[PDB]
Amino acid sequence: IDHWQVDYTHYEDKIILVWVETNSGLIYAERVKGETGQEFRVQTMKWYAMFAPKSLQSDNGPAFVAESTQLLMKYLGIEHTTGIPWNPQSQALVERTHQTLKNTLEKLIPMFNAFESALAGTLITLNIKRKGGLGTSPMDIFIFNKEQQRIQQQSKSIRFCYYRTRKRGHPGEWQGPTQVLWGGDGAIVVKDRGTDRYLVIANKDVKFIPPP
Amino acid sequence: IDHWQVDYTHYEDKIILVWVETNSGLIYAERVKGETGQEFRVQTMKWYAMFAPKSLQSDNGPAFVAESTQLLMKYLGIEHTTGIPWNPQSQALVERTHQTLKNTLEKLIPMFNAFESALAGTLITLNIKRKGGLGTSPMDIFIFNKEQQRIQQQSKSIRFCYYRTRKRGHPGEWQGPTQVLWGGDGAIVVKDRGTDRYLVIANKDVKFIPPP
């Protein structure tokens, strides 16, 4: 679904916190100063802001089992299970992913001035550049999985707005208010009182009016 | 499309590099030590790794016009235009976005120990939590825009593999090789030689065999 595993990793004299998403192989990594629970909670916020995860697995390291970490996971709606379970599919993918990261970091370090740049370039190579058997990257798969979840709840489920049209690429005067006849994916349909014809407007040319 | 604007921002005695995507309102921010071109190129790598952008607008600040920055933008395939153009839709969205960030950061600072956590919590609030007129967040819109571009080139466009089935949630022995009859979105179709029936396998239960 949106399940992740987190580990502390060592590279020469540096400590790297490594997150791996067990469905798409997406990777997220960042250099840290130590293994304290406070810095792990800082990294936890940056991780959630980027990916909106749902569940997490880790070993029972101190930063992971601290009471403040457990309360933070619950506060963000994350089901965090300490102790790695038995799963051949995810365990094999995590192992390959960790090995490829170290090998790629070895090549990209001499290209850049900063270790942070080499690590960022490594994420680019693994998440964006390499394509699987179907020609999709890990980030292509992660995004596709996100959009599938949104269609799920949206399909299982009166507005008014201002709108404007564009002639030769330039937006016009705001018009309305008028009823939103149909809300679509990035577009709405309204009926123009002036010309008495139906129109389609994009989201960036619509200002919705808030319910009561 | 995937167009962004970048600015340096001041908050008390801190410097924040702020990126805003002009189609979805998505925001990315990070505290920096100064305004040098070297640190800006470091931040540029982290930004590209996360969002895979295409175009960028900024003013003609020194970190933005340096020769190494221009070559880096070209190296990553980014059309970078120094000097902000005239565009009412994007200029109004950037202004609102910057004001909301400062107001939200003011509230979340006393909740956290670290300024980095308050900034990360601010990104959560703006990108994930708040919903527009159609009930979609800025991150919902950003992702939806990504998946639309992938369907575009994929629709405008012989494989073999190993595969395995799952009974009660557990994966079975690897089987094959066999021809990929149809590659779908997260699934393939193969014909089982043993039972002589068609099957559907998910991507994580497929090991593709590389072309020559």
From Swiss-Prot, chains A, B:
Domain of life the protein comes from: Viruses
Residues binding Mg(2+) 3: 7, 59, 95
DNA-binding stretch(es), residue numbering of this chain: 159-211
Ranges for domain Integrase catalytic: 1-146
Job of this protein: Catalyzes viral DNA integration into the host chromosome, by performing a series of DNA cutting and joining reactions.
Quaternary data: Homotetramer; further associates as a homohexadecamer.
Protein's name according to its UniProt entry: Integrase
Organism: Maedi visna virus (strain KV1772)
Taxonomic lineage of the native organism: Viruses, Riboviria, Pararnavirae, Artverviricota, Revtraviricetes
Gene name per UniProt: pol
Parent-protein start and end of this portion: 1285 to 1500 of 1506
